[PDB]
């Protein structure tokens, strides 16, 4: 809330390194807002929430330049951004949980009479991740 | 089980493109084993299980060359490989579910008195994904 943090403290609190925070600072992505009377710069609550936004974007494989754009958007609403991120994180949790179900079904067939239909081997894989890989194979 | 598939059929069944399967074939990753009397090559059940292994590896961001190595390992046990993949897929599902919890806790603080401790903003992020990004920032 009123707490403010040096780079050393922000690293320890967030798990982002001092190296990364200096880089995020240099490129205008995350600049410590709070300034003391000694000219030192400190991360405040608003900076912590922006860094959390950066970590959510990276969890969701958003590329570094796209992050700046998304955060600096005029009329940026943090609660809206969080709800959109929730939906995409939930969908990733459901994909991974579906892929465990596929492993479970495959193991049981495999240690059973091996009668399970072939198509059931392949339900659950991310079509998006396949397109980005077939596109790569065309070099 | 006894079913065998052309490239066109294997694409339709698996969701992998004809382009990718020809590439997987060329580089020795997945070569249709079953051969007919007309010299044509067909994917059998064992090929379907190897392709499922490739799709699990790609879900778990294993690099293409590492896949060959892992599948061609002497004493390769498919049920062992599946159980190891289960554990890593489950862990990804738990990470994504934890990140939704973090969003939920943050939203409720944000629309509340904003008293939640700062450290709670940052629990749940993948430290591995952070190291691979701080390492990248050193170019």
Residue numbers in the entry:
A (entry chain A), B (entry chain A): 0 to 138
Published text:
As a result, diffraction-quality crystals of SkgA were obtained, and the structure was determined at a resolution of 2.5 Å using the single-wavelength anomalous dispersion phasing method. Although full-length SkgA (residues 1–255) protein was used for crystallization, only residues 1–138 were observed in the final structure. The established structure consists of the N-terminal MerR-type HTH motif, coiled-coil region, and the initial two α-helices of the C-terminal TipAS domain, whereas the rest of the TipAS domain was still invisible in the current model, probably because of structural flexibility or diffraction damage. Because MerR family proteins reportedly function as dimers and SkgA protein also exhibits a dimer conformation in solution, a dimeric SkgA structure was established by combining two molecules from two adjacent asymmetric units for subsequent analysis. Remarkably, apart from the coiled-coil α5 helices, the α6–α7 region and N-terminal domain are also involved in the dimeric interface. Fifteen residues of the α6–α7 region of each protomer interact with the N-terminal domain of the other protomer via hydrogen bonding, ionic bonding, and hydrophobic interactions, which contribute to stabilization of the conformation of the α6–α7 region. Eleven residues of the N-terminal α1–α2 region exhibit interactions with ten residues of the α6–α7 region via hydrophobic interactions and three hydrogen bonds formed by residue pairs Tyr4–Asp117, Ser16–Glu133, and Tyr23–His132.
The TipA (thiostrepton-induced protein A) class of transcriptional regulators found in diverse bacteria is viewed as a minimal autoregulated MDR system. TipA proteins belong to a subset of the superfamily of mercuric ion resistance (MerR)–like transcriptional regulators that contain an N-terminal helix-turn-helix (HTH) motif followed by an intermediate linking coiled-coil (PF00376 MerR and PF13411 MerR_1 families in the Pfam database) and a C-terminal TipAS-type effector domain (PF07739 TipAS family in the Pfam database). In addition to S. lividans, TipA-class proteins have also been reported to have crucial regulatory functions in other species such as Mta (multidrug transporter activation protein) from Bacillus subtilis, stationary-phase regulation of KatG protein (SkgA) from Caulobacter crescentus, and AlbA (albicidin resistance protein) containing two tandem TipAS domains from Klebsiella oxytoca. Structural and biochemical analyses indicated that the interaction of TipA regulators with promoter DNA is hindered in the apo state and revealed an unexpected activation mechanism in which drug binding induces conformational turnover of the TipAS domain to release the N-terminal HTH motif for promoter DNA binding and subsequent transcriptional activation, during which the α6–α7 region may serve as a key switch element to drive the global transition.
